[PDB]
Amino acid sequence: RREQLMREEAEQKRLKTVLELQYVLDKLGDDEVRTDLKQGLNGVPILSEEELSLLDEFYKLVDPERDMSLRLNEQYEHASIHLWDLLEGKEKPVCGTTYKVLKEIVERVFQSNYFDSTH
């Protein structure tokens, strides 16, 4: 019953991580950001064209365009599952890779501290 409160804290931290991820993926639409990440801070890249492609492709899944076939409460089912699986870092296929690989990529982007500075 301290485990429930620990669960709540975990869920909140997960929400925070999701928000941060949404911010990053949103910024990955900028050509400056993309180049600056494709090059390093000194020719040791945080990202490669393949990884960045994987992120664009996952981005397609988690921020889908409104499909007129779906009700609003249906639109983000797969998105929610994609984000949750990403958080879990599972070895289940997605895009051209697994959620584990993607989670690692997101990890390197986060830990580069690129988004702590301004460029």
> Which residues in this chain contact a second copy in the complex, by CB under 8 A?
7-8, 11-16, 18-20, 23-24, 66, 68, 71-73, 75-77, 79-81, 83-84, 110, 113, 115-116, 118
Residue 20 or residue 57: which is nearer to a second copy going by CB? 20
| Cα distances (angstroms) measured from residue 64 to each of 54, 84, 85 | 15, 16, 17
Looking at beta carbons only, is 19 or 53 nearer to a second copy?
Answer: 19
Tell me how far the alpha carbon of residue 44 is from its chain's centroid. 22
Least separation in angstroms between residue 112's CB and a second copy is 10
CB of 74 to a second copy, least distance (A): 9
Q: Which is nearer to a second copy, 26 or 50 (CB)?
A: 26
Residue 62 Cβ, how far from a second copy at the closest point, in Å? 8
When the beta carbons of 42 and 117 are compared against a second copy, the nearer one is 117
Max CA separation in the chain (angstroms) = 50
* Residue of 54, 32, 31 whose CA lies nearest to 105: 54
Report how far apart the first and last C-alpha atoms of the chain are (Å, whole number). Answer: 46
Query: In degrees, to the nearest 5, what angle opens at C-alpha 91 toward C-alphas 6 and 102?
Result: 80
Min. distance of Cβ 39 from a second copy in angstroms? 20
Secondary structure (3-state) at 93: strand
